[PDB]
Amino acid sequence: NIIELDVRAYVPALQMAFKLGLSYTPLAEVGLNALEEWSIYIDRHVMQPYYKDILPCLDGYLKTSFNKVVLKHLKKTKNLSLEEIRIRVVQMLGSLGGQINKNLLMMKSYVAWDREKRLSFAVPFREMKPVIFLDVFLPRVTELALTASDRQTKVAACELLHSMVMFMLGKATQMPEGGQGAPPMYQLYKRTFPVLLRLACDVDQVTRQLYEPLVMQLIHWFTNNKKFESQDTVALLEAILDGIVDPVDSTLRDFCGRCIREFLKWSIKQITPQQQEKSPVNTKSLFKRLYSLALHPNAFKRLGASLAFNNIYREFREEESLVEQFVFEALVIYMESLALAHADEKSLGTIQQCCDAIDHLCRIIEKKHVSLNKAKKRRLPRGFPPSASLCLLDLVKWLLAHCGRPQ
Amino acid sequence: WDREKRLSFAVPFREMKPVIFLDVFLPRVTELALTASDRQTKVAACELLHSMVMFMLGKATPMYQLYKRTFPVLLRLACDVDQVTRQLYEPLVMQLIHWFTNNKKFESQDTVALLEAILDGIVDPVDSTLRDFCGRC
Amino acid sequence: MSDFKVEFLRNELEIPGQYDGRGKPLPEYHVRIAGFDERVTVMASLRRPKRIIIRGHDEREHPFLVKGGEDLRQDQRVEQLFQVMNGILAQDSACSQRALQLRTYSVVPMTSRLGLIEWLENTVTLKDLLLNTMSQEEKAAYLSDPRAPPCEYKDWLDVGAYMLMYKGANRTETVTSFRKRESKVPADLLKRAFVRMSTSPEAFLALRSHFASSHALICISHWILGIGDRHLNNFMVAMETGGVIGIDFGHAFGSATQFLPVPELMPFRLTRQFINLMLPMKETGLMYSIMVHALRAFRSDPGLLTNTMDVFVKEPSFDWKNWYPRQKICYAKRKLAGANPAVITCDELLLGHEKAPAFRDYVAVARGSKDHNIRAQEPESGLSEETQVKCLMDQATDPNILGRTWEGWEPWM
Amino acid sequence: QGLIDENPGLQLIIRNFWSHETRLPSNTLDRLLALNSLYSPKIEVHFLSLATNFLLEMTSMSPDYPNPMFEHPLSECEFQEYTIDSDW
């Protein structure tokens, strides 16, 4: 009766259930019972706009496939699964409807991603040394380690995926050429990683505690000034959105934010500073992209920006030259975050993220507000239309003049 | 030359791969490629020199000393008046120049190689033809 | 970003033509521009295509091609109409019963001396998409040395003397000429490229089957308009998935061959590779039924078409530089009320090419090259779906390479 | 002493005869052991040479010995056989 209203808002909980019912079948089971309720009570009209959510989410979890002859009175007998759940899944499915059930459902989504089958392996033996090509197994194992029941089996698939990606990254660094990142798997990895990235921090006994360290050693290895030349940037830009700005897997968002702060830390450690000064994608561009993502108007974009800043603040407070060069920018951008967060719903946790942000701002000020008390010609943001030697008083009076906000 | 060696080689077989270091042989094999009366001997040693240098380019995946060992051998052998070794070096010299011309091959060896080689091929009291070859270089 | 730095202070400057919302309010933070990947990417043509690369508000680059000086509002109407009907034409057989969907495009010209479009940058013309597939030395020699002389100049002969040489061109000699066109260009390498880009042969199958059917429907749309895609280099294809966009709308209302200095005997281009995508297809099957569905759904379109391109100005300047708008709408109605492709092609030819050499030959091969082609004149100005489509594909699509071909019309390819 | 025929074909077939697993057992280990027991009191000048010959010609069966050792050229271009003048 209550959930008759805003039926759309209830779907995401179902999506989370079908994201997590593997480790707990009754989770998805009770989600199914709620589905049954909605079918029984609600009219088809308003449930229709998300049959396209029902069937694709229904797709989840579904792809997998004494006592002796002597009459002892058997007093032991006298003294007295996910699979059944999936049987109920198909039961209710056939209770839905061909129009409904066909909602499972162009680009065709796989167009032979790698046209150059360079990923292979020569299996050695005694009579001959045959050669086997491995990229064909690549997308398959992507879906498998991506989606598989049998934690034993799924994690074994993840293990082999780990081993093979470890082999093929070095093999990519065997005959580099000019063009893209030599494109051995550069473009075919900008499309590969995000699954393993979320496998770094997954709900698991094992793949979490080995894949998070995996990606740590990877991207801190891939933050060298020798391991520098856009081989870092492909993975970095890959992370930028999927890990940070994304509807689901909030623990991934926090994981990747602290991963990025750890990453840039290890960069500055093993990047000779000029290689960041000459780096286009660098700390300054990091500031610019943070400004943009906070500016990008959407719940996910701004939440990712704010949470990532709150993560990185641990080292950024230790950062001194940039923070001295960047306060007016940070202050006005977090002002923008506040304005556009108070222009819309506040139930978003990003309002608390912005509270963390203002904590960070007042904190960095209270270290050096004497370095701000003076009009210092640090670089200017768009949020400060007057161009002058920037002072703490300057931002203060700007804020005062821009008080009385509609938000 | 150095307390560490880098010229490992596992000999392929059906069940064993005996790894052999080749760093020790390089001086003497360079001498024989430089000095071998039998044209078969000298030609085979020069071919082997070419193959092993291609191999150690493969190994480049900061071995300055090996490079400085190989440079004078190249200098002396390139200017061979006999047709065979200059015949080898023509593609050899051009092809090593092109290996040098890589941006990733512009670090502390190729520049050292050239500044050594072209300078020494001329400063020699003998073989002004080596000076001319270094001019081509 | 030059005069006035990237900011929304002036305005959230944003892509033209993408607020096209059918009554629905458009978003305010709708996908806009902030940042720029602008580099000097100016293609060389009559239009000087300027692929300006726009890092939108997402900072992601959005290359936009910019044309030159001509009535490119014509292209705007062409693309808009294409979306209009194709978007409600033939997606699936059941959806053809529904009469929905065909992949289209949109262009947003600014003036009669400029035109702004979006540079997809994920596509490729068919000639280029093949030129990188075969042994490229074959692409150079085979398409350079034995390209014009052995087949094209056997058909004609001689530039300049090319048209008068076609005055001495006939059906069977140009049939042999087209056979030599097949020997002036490789074959079946389309399948090679397709399989090297195919991981699953059958998802492939559906994809390029829909691609071929959509290309054929585009070709009959060309016949309806007379769009000037003389060579296959004109025609584009998305290397990513085979997405299709029209090219070179410099001729319309039957002007594909109405004032052309070089012969253009094509009601629609019938490149042999489009047939050789896979040998067993006879082209008489799936797409045949597709255009049968299309013409089945071509009932009440004159009530909008002739009421739309003639709504404003009736396509100005598209034929003086390449006339009467009453004449143009007359041709459009004749081709639209159910027309013989042979009759339409011959009347378009003789109108303006009557002084051209082989004008009688041109209109004859328009009516057909051989008996099983010259019979096309009999169902003049109206005939059933299957009859019309097989007539167009046989007595019109084939004899373009069997009467005479322009060398820049790309007959071999 | 026939391994060193001035007839290269004769000594070659003699090498084949020896290297044969009957005369010289196939396994590299036992081939080596037989070689250690096969030295002639007069061949130490070339005993090592011929032993190396036999050992290396066993590697022929190695179905990678006739194969390339590298497949990832740092600098890749056309590679065709080069000619040389060999006047008497």
XYZ file of C-alpha atoms in Angstrom, chain C residues 44-398:
355
model
C 40.451 19.121 -47.729
C 37.363 19.302 -49.946
C 35.070 21.788 -51.640
C 33.609 22.327 -48.160
C 36.946 22.267 -46.285
C 35.602 19.877 -43.612
C 36.732 21.322 -40.278
C 36.498 18.584 -37.632
C 36.503 20.884 -34.616
C 37.095 18.774 -31.517
C 34.845 19.817 -28.637
C 35.727 18.757 -25.104
C 32.170 18.987 -23.804
C 31.127 19.802 -20.240
C 32.343 16.278 -19.433
C 35.702 17.434 -20.892
C 35.390 14.516 -23.332
C 36.283 15.454 -26.889
C 33.393 15.796 -29.356
C 34.893 16.412 -32.805
C 32.500 18.397 -34.999
C 33.025 18.603 -38.749
C 32.474 22.051 -40.280
C 31.675 22.325 -43.991
C 32.001 25.307 -46.337
C 29.779 27.484 -48.500
C 26.596 26.059 -50.036
C 22.906 25.557 -49.286
C 23.579 23.154 -46.429
C 20.143 23.783 -44.945
C 19.224 21.303 -47.668
C 21.343 18.820 -45.726
C 19.542 19.832 -42.531
C 16.156 19.018 -44.058
C 17.584 15.817 -45.538
C 18.848 14.572 -42.175
C 15.730 15.691 -40.301
C 13.439 13.906 -42.747
C 15.710 10.866 -42.650
C 15.308 10.638 -38.894
C 11.573 11.272 -39.322
C 10.658 8.439 -41.633
C 13.577 6.016 -41.194
C 12.977 6.244 -37.391
C 9.426 4.928 -38.162
C 10.206 2.667 -41.194
C 11.706 -0.862 -40.884
C 13.711 -2.146 -37.857
C 12.556 -5.727 -37.635
C 10.066 -7.777 -39.632
C 7.633 -7.582 -36.722
C 8.793 -4.002 -36.237
C 8.214 -3.398 -39.946
C 4.681 -4.533 -39.193
C 5.058 -1.834 -36.558
C 7.012 0.263 -39.116
C 9.743 1.541 -36.799
C 13.422 2.472 -36.730
C 16.355 3.076 -39.001
C 19.741 4.451 -37.988
C 20.024 8.046 -39.201
C 21.952 11.262 -38.564
C 21.467 15.001 -38.054
C 23.320 18.082 -39.324
C 23.047 21.688 -38.132
C 24.148 24.232 -40.761
C 24.487 27.857 -39.699
C 24.082 29.802 -42.960
C 23.986 29.291 -46.722
C 27.783 29.706 -46.590
C 28.517 27.450 -43.597
C 27.425 24.150 -42.108
C 28.098 22.616 -38.697
C 27.929 18.849 -38.235
C 29.350 16.414 -35.705
C 32.598 14.683 -36.675
C 31.941 11.117 -35.548
C 35.650 10.155 -35.714
C 34.670 6.489 -35.191
C 33.733 5.828 -38.816
C 35.447 5.324 -42.170
C 34.484 5.422 -45.815
C 34.157 2.023 -47.442
C 37.100 2.600 -49.784
C 39.357 3.505 -46.860
C 37.941 0.739 -44.667
C 39.093 -1.684 -47.345
C 42.321 0.064 -48.386
C 43.799 -0.825 -44.992
C 42.584 -4.451 -45.207
C 44.159 -5.972 -48.315
C 47.855 -6.012 -49.055
C 48.232 -2.235 -49.312
C 50.656 -2.613 -52.223
C 47.731 -4.193 -54.064
C 45.617 -1.193 -53.048
C 48.238 1.035 -54.672
C 49.114 -0.836 -57.867
C 45.980 -2.886 -58.609
C 43.778 0.169 -58.048
C 46.255 2.473 -59.813
C 47.816 0.671 -62.783
C 44.969 -1.686 -63.894
C 42.118 0.583 -62.793
C 41.263 3.118 -65.517
C 42.900 1.594 -68.655
C 41.919 -2.085 -68.647
C 38.244 -1.768 -67.667
C 37.192 1.884 -67.474
C 38.970 2.908 -70.677
C 37.890 -0.306 -72.372
C 34.353 0.799 -71.516
C 34.994 4.311 -72.838
C 37.895 4.098 -75.287
C 40.386 9.134 -72.595
C 39.468 11.991 -70.263
C 37.281 14.665 -71.812
C 36.749 12.192 -74.652
C 35.245 10.018 -71.944
C 31.627 11.029 -72.541
C 31.870 10.880 -76.335
C 33.646 7.554 -75.874
C 30.564 6.405 -73.983
C 28.662 7.610 -77.038
C 30.343 4.534 -78.511
C 29.494 2.399 -75.477
C 26.856 -0.330 -75.437
C 25.410 -2.997 -73.155
C 27.599 -6.049 -73.759
C 30.913 -4.212 -74.095
C 30.255 -2.498 -70.766
C 29.158 -5.826 -69.274
C 32.617 -7.082 -70.201
C 33.986 -3.778 -68.906
C 32.347 -4.343 -65.513
C 33.681 -7.899 -65.532
C 37.086 -6.251 -65.927
C 36.141 -3.837 -63.131
C 35.973 -6.968 -60.997
C 39.535 -7.487 -62.248
C 40.304 -3.820 -61.513
C 39.569 -4.299 -57.791
C 40.018 -7.148 -55.259
C 37.153 -9.397 -54.171
C 35.879 -11.113 -51.006
C 38.357 -9.195 -48.820
C 35.276 -7.643 -47.231
C 34.683 -11.062 -45.687
C 38.311 -11.093 -44.521
C 37.927 -7.765 -42.732
C 34.561 -8.867 -41.370
C 35.889 -12.098 -39.887
C 38.977 -10.420 -38.434
C 36.528 -8.072 -36.734
C 34.131 -10.946 -35.913
C 34.539 -12.850 -32.650
C 31.112 -14.516 -32.815
C 30.161 -15.274 -36.438
C 26.419 -15.032 -35.768
C 26.217 -11.803 -33.794
C 28.292 -10.745 -36.758
C 25.642 -12.333 -38.977
C 22.798 -10.299 -37.530
C 24.894 -7.127 -37.459
C 26.046 -7.079 -41.057
C 22.734 -8.475 -42.298
C 20.983 -5.469 -40.778
C 23.823 -3.365 -42.171
C 23.231 -4.642 -45.706
C 19.457 -4.236 -45.479
C 19.847 -0.702 -44.115
C 22.318 0.101 -46.891
C 19.826 -1.135 -49.480
C 17.017 0.947 -47.979
C 19.403 3.908 -47.946
C 20.071 3.219 -51.619
C 16.389 3.288 -52.512
C 16.136 6.493 -50.483
C 18.939 7.795 -52.710
C 16.857 6.749 -55.712
C 13.948 8.671 -54.193
C 16.128 11.772 -53.790
C 18.982 11.547 -56.276
C 21.715 12.203 -53.728
C 25.160 12.623 -55.269
C 27.184 9.778 -53.754
C 28.905 8.995 -57.035
C 31.774 6.917 -55.670
C 31.987 4.450 -52.816
C 34.508 6.821 -51.241
C 31.484 9.041 -50.657
C 29.672 6.349 -48.692
C 30.677 6.052 -45.036
C 30.626 3.124 -42.623
C 31.403 3.142 -38.912
C 34.465 0.983 -38.341
C 33.108 0.393 -34.833
C 29.813 -1.240 -35.844
C 28.907 -0.244 -39.407
C 26.839 2.819 -38.557
C 25.487 4.541 -41.644
C 25.169 8.235 -42.506
C 24.285 9.886 -45.800
C 26.886 11.741 -47.844
C 26.960 14.517 -50.432
C 23.382 15.725 -50.778
C 24.407 17.932 -53.696
C 21.627 16.628 -55.936
C 17.932 16.052 -55.309
C 14.558 15.824 -57.064
C 16.047 13.526 -59.690
C 19.236 15.556 -60.160
C 21.667 12.712 -59.416
C 22.113 12.646 -63.199
C 20.431 15.814 -64.463
C 23.278 18.338 -64.887
C 26.343 16.207 -64.124
C 29.366 16.947 -66.349
C 30.395 13.290 -65.999
C 27.889 10.440 -66.473
C 26.240 9.100 -63.306
C 24.180 6.114 -64.525
C 23.410 5.031 -60.937
C 19.861 5.146 -59.471
C 21.868 3.743 -56.487
C 25.476 2.528 -56.099
C 25.797 -1.255 -56.396
C 29.426 -1.784 -55.362
C 30.416 -5.395 -55.932
C 31.949 -5.760 -52.468
C 28.582 -4.998 -50.894
C 27.459 -8.125 -52.745
C 30.658 -10.034 -51.915
C 30.255 -9.532 -48.165
C 29.418 -13.239 -48.313
C 29.000 -15.144 -51.561
C 25.871 -17.273 -50.878
C 23.621 -14.220 -50.462
C 21.694 -13.554 -53.670
C 20.452 -10.167 -52.367
C 17.026 -11.519 -53.328
C 16.303 -12.621 -49.780
C 16.269 -10.673 -46.546
C 16.783 -7.125 -47.808
C 14.466 -7.845 -50.724
C 11.695 -8.452 -48.206
C 12.946 -5.444 -46.237
C 12.339 -3.035 -49.094
C 9.080 -4.855 -49.815
C 8.089 -3.953 -46.254
C 9.365 -0.422 -46.832
C 7.270 0.179 -49.939
C 4.402 -1.501 -48.098
C 4.854 1.268 -45.516
C 5.363 3.939 -48.211
C 1.626 4.653 -48.442
C 0.876 8.010 -46.804
C 4.275 9.693 -47.074
C 3.487 12.246 -49.855
C 1.052 13.924 -47.465
C 4.125 14.878 -45.444
C 7.130 14.682 -47.784
C 5.850 16.773 -50.676
C 4.258 18.840 -47.925
C 7.609 19.266 -46.134
C 10.501 19.841 -48.535
C 8.209 22.137 -50.521
C 6.813 23.598 -47.287
C 9.346 26.423 -46.980
C 11.189 27.175 -50.235
C 11.029 23.814 -52.057
C 14.790 23.189 -51.910
C 16.416 26.328 -53.354
C 19.745 26.440 -55.155
C 20.172 22.657 -55.107
C 19.823 22.413 -58.896
C 20.918 25.765 -60.354
C 24.453 25.192 -59.042
C 24.256 21.421 -59.618
C 15.143 25.302 -62.675
C 11.663 25.470 -61.158
C 10.625 24.296 -57.672
C 7.312 23.368 -59.278
C 9.318 21.093 -61.563
C 11.220 19.699 -58.576
C 8.052 18.881 -56.648
C 6.595 17.414 -59.845
C 9.567 15.056 -60.071
C 9.269 14.246 -56.367
C 5.572 13.406 -56.708
C 6.217 11.310 -59.821
C 8.917 9.306 -58.044
C 6.787 9.166 -54.881
C 3.370 8.172 -56.256
C 4.797 4.822 -57.346
C 7.214 4.995 -60.253
C 9.288 2.780 -62.498
C 12.968 3.140 -61.525
C 13.833 2.744 -65.208
C 11.421 5.478 -66.304
C 12.550 7.835 -63.549
C 16.224 7.242 -64.301
C 15.761 7.739 -68.046
C 13.728 10.935 -67.654
C 16.269 12.311 -65.175
C 19.063 11.454 -67.625
C 17.557 12.902 -70.796
C 16.548 15.987 -68.808
C 19.850 17.852 -68.984
C 21.943 15.019 -70.449
C 20.061 14.922 -73.757
C 22.973 16.945 -75.136
C 25.404 14.589 -73.396
C 26.914 11.811 -75.543
C 25.093 8.468 -75.513
C 21.988 10.250 -74.219
C 19.883 7.678 -76.047
C 22.222 4.971 -74.746
C 22.057 6.416 -71.229
C 18.261 6.522 -71.112
C 18.127 3.073 -72.737
C 20.336 1.427 -70.116
C 18.240 3.343 -67.589
C 15.275 1.503 -69.089
C 17.614 -1.509 -69.168
C 20.722 -2.951 -70.795
C 19.530 -6.441 -71.772
C 16.075 -7.905 -72.394
C 15.809 -8.954 -68.737
C 16.698 -5.308 -68.174
C 14.944 -3.414 -70.983
C 11.666 -4.956 -69.832
C 11.851 -2.455 -66.948
C 10.166 0.157 -69.138
C 6.978 -1.934 -69.222
C 5.913 -1.419 -65.562
C 6.255 2.312 -66.085
C 5.389 4.766 -63.304
C 4.074 2.334 -60.730
C 4.347 -1.365 -59.902
C 4.168 -3.654 -56.902
C 6.703 -3.883 -54.082
C 8.541 -7.005 -55.231
C 8.309 -6.072 -58.899
C 9.596 -2.554 -58.273
C 12.465 -3.640 -56.037
C 13.626 -6.447 -58.321
C 13.304 -4.066 -61.267
C 15.473 -1.524 -59.472
C 18.025 -4.119 -58.365
C 18.195 -5.852 -61.765
C 17.351 -3.478 -64.617
C 18.561 -0.388 -62.790
C 21.180 -1.416 -60.220
C 23.069 -3.723 -62.583
